[PDB]
Amino acid sequence: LFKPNYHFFPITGWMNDPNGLIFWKGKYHMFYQYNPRKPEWGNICWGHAVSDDLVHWRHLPVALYPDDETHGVFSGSAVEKDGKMFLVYTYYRDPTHNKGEKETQCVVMSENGLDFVKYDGNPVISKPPEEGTHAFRDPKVNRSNGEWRMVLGSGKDEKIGRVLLYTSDDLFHWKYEGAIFEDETTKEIDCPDLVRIGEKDILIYSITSTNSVLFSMGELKEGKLNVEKRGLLDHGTDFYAAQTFFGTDRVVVIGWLQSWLRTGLYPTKREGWNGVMSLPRELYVENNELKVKPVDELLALRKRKVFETAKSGTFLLDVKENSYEIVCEFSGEIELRMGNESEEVVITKSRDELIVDTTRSGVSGGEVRKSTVEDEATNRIRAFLDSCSVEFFFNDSIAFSFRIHPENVYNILSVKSNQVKLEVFELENIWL
Ligand SMILES: OC[C@H]1O[C@H](OC[C@H]2O[C@H](O[C@]3(CO)O[C@H](CO)[C@@H](O)[C@@H]3O)[C@H](O)[C@@H](O)[C@@H]2O)[C@H](O)[C@@H](O)[C@H]1O
Structure with missing residues (x-):
């Protein structure tokens, strides 16, 4: 697992x-x-x-x-x-x-x-x-x-x-x-x-x-x-x-x-x-x-584009394991949820604050963390999900890193914002 x-x-x-x-x-x-x-x-x-x-x-x-x-x-x-x-x-x-x-x-x-x-x-x-x-x-x-x-x-x-x-x-x-x-x-x-x-x-x-x-x-x-x-x-x-x-x-x-x-x-x-x-x-x-x-070298892990959208909604992903990257461009406020029927991690831009909530992420629970951030015309989140972690990167400026322990694949993605451009890439297994 x-x-x-x-x-x-x-x-x-x-x-x-x-x-x-x-x-x-x-x-x-x-x-x-x-x-x-x-x-x-x-x-x-x-x-x-x-x-x-x-x-x-x-x-x-x-x-x-x-x-x-x-x-x-x-x-x-x-x-x-x-x-x-x-x-x-x-x-x-x-x-x-x-x-x-x-x-x-x-x-x-x-x-x-x-x-x-x-x-x-x-x-x-x-x-x-x-x-x-x-x-x-x-x-x-x-x-x-x-x-x-x-x-x-x-x-x-x-x-x-x-x-x-x-x-x-x-x-x-x-x-x-x-x-x-x-x-x-x-x-x-x-x-x-x-x-x-x-x-x-x-x-x-x-x-x-x-x-x-x-x-x-x-x-x-x-x-x-x-x-x-x-x-x-x-x-x-x-x-x-x-x-x-x-x-x-x-x-x-x-x-x-x-x-x-x-x-x-x-x-x-x-x-x-x-x-x-x-x-x-x-x-x-x-x-x-x-x-x-x-680092730029991480781009080489991207294999196939599993999903993409230019509008808000809730979506079933065609992914077989927790090994993908969400790339999300947006304006204004956002709520991005990743998870399944029992588990989820939530990241929200509410006014001048970015908040992440992993309390419902899996078998080790989690916590809520936040930071105040500068507004930009267009914002960008990159989220790397792997078997027991999620790392969020925002505006090439700050990072949030969390250990999570999902019992199942995070095959449901929900986005709520205006001017959204979101893609999901499967990420390569480096071992085999
Ligand atoms: O007081 C003895 C202490 O020994 C153990 O921990 C050592 C040390 O680990 C940590 O420091 C770092 C940073 O993560 O880890 C390596 C050791 O592997 C260090 O070179 C480096 O500073 C902790 O952050 C320190 O607080 C800790 O002293 C053992 O795990 C402790 O319970 C305790 O017995």
Whole structure:
């Protein structure tokens, strides 16, 4: 029932954060937090997959293992140096009765993308820079002004979450440059990512207590991110631990398509697996605003046009599974429902608000989420339905991602608006 047709998910066991995202030697590499042993978190390794086109994933052998039963290979990033692939990651030691957990930052190298060797000088960063630092992890490394820069997530005095910055000329010797950013609404920050998009420094980061990916855009000046604008990267319930790819022109982000808060509510563990990755999105700046849209490569998934209409109504779709894309252009207000006789997801544009309701979606129920949006002459929704998810994209500007678990095919579509142009495309199964 719930195995995705065109999203990445593990062949068995548990998966969370996307790691080591890199375009290397002509192919997109994606690693991930992985426990093959069972559909729950534990004994974490880095799984590995590859695609030519950000869509057609193929599983590779597990890339990184912990050395023993009391450690984990926590999240991190990937870069290219001297033609070789380097992975930079947090190595985690379990707490014991006398000791708290210990986190260090380490480096691994690969000349072929298949075999990975450990740097002899590990750990590359052996301890936190200040006292009272906890959750010291998730190194995201990029190039800036002739130098390597690393951002790390952290928490200070069990009170305020901060992003720490280190620099390096060679990827092995790092210098602490202070806390560039803090968010007082959380005790810790996960999975930071500092990118540059058109004259602007953008800090992407995750907060575990609301399970949200936020951003702060502005200018790094004198060791501090001067924030001009703030927001969410995604407005739904299931988008977490976002990371962007190294080595591409566009900024391309993938997130974990799941929530820590709602993990115990989901049914895939019965099938022997847990965890799904989001579709990739391009992040870009237009009119001094950060915008999110689906990557262009997703168009290749479109097989045959199952349905189309230029008027409102309720329609039976000729689809045999939950694997399709709704493309909908409209003016004014809209109500779009997708579902069957027992289940539905509803998205409504009511005045200056976009609202999504997955409470009736399937066997994990759901929630209601909303965002205020700018009016346009013509609006556009793209909705990607797969076996256990729906991702909505609006005006190439914002995204809402939700995990849903329908017991049956969503073969009924209802639209109510003026000036509607709606199409449905079957989406290809990438596996078989
Ligand atoms: O306090 C120990 C903690 O261990 C487990 O969770 C670890 C960690 O997982 C999450 O952080 C990320 C982001 O999703 O996931 C990887 C680990 O796989 C981290 O590198 C990265 O920061 C959560 O978001 C954190 O709050 C959490 O500490 C276990 O699952 C917890 O119950 C707890 O025992």
